[model samples]
Target: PMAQVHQGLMPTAPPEDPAVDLLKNYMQLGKQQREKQRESREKPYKEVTEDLLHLNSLFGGDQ
Candidate 1:
């Protein structure tokens, strides 16, 4: 029950206008104006964090 509890807010994908080539150019320009903000942050996090979490989870557990 606790693991399934998101409480209220859930994740969402940010808006990406692929029609615009300048999108990449605008990247990291204005603060918080980043494109596909969701994927950018989520990709590496999903790719990297979970692996490390898995590796570390067993290190310090119930004694």
Candidate 2:
């Protein structure tokens, strides 16, 4: 279905490079410590991961 396609369900990584991409950098940013750096950690987490999760869920998809 479209959702599956949108979720990238190819059972393999995208041919597009995740390592050398802005989106990948954003994902790495999610690993930052929130306790010692709340805003810095949170802004990227929400802007990158959480927002995507919510959007996908809303659109019948996921990561």
Candidate 3:
């Protein structure tokens, strides 16, 4: 079938390097932690800013 011919062209990961993979794991974990913190603690501030902006618009107040 046509599918069989394209199977060999599928991309795959190269062999992992121990040092590089370990550093990559650390980088990925740090990114996930930062995102989790921002998601929980920072979103409220973002909402407050948007609300303030809306109020300013209603009152014709400049930043």
Candidate 4:
């Protein structure tokens, strides 16, 4: 008798849009790859430039 009441509310259509889900998935994936590239490849060059500047400062003070 109680089970009949629970069955009354069946599954309805999901509120989420497929287009928005696809776009968000692509954007999130792109953001992750871009961030990984920045951290792995780009940051080393920045560190190299900073290291060169530090060396320049040391050399400049010597003269």
List the lowest-lDDT window of 10 residues for candidate 3.
10-19
Candidate 2 residue-wise lDDT, 1-63, digit = tens = 677566764556667865679776766666654433766656765578778877877887544
Clashing pairs in 1: none
TM-score of 4: 0.41
lDDT, candidate 3, 1-63, per-residue tens: 678775778556666658788798889989888777876677676778988889888898666
Task: Report every candidate's CA lDDT.
Answer: 0.62, 0.66, 0.78, 0.79
Model 1 lDDT tens row, 5-58 = 864656564466553756755654553445357556666657687778777885
TM-score of 3: 0.38
TM-scores for candidates 1 onward, in order? 0.22, 0.24, 0.38, 0.41
Candidate 2 residue 54 Cα shift, in angstroms, is: 0.5
Off by over 4 Å in 3: 1-19, 54-63
Model 3 lDDT vs. the true structure? 0.78
Reference-based TM-score, model 1: 0.22
RMSD in Å for model 2: 23.9
Rank all candidate structures by their lDDT, best first, as comma-separated numbers.
Answer: 4, 3, 2, 1
List RMSD in Å for every model shown.
23.7, 23.9, 12.1, 6.3
For lDDT, candidate 3 versus 4, the one ahead is 4
Instruction: Give the backbone clash total of model 4.
Output: 0
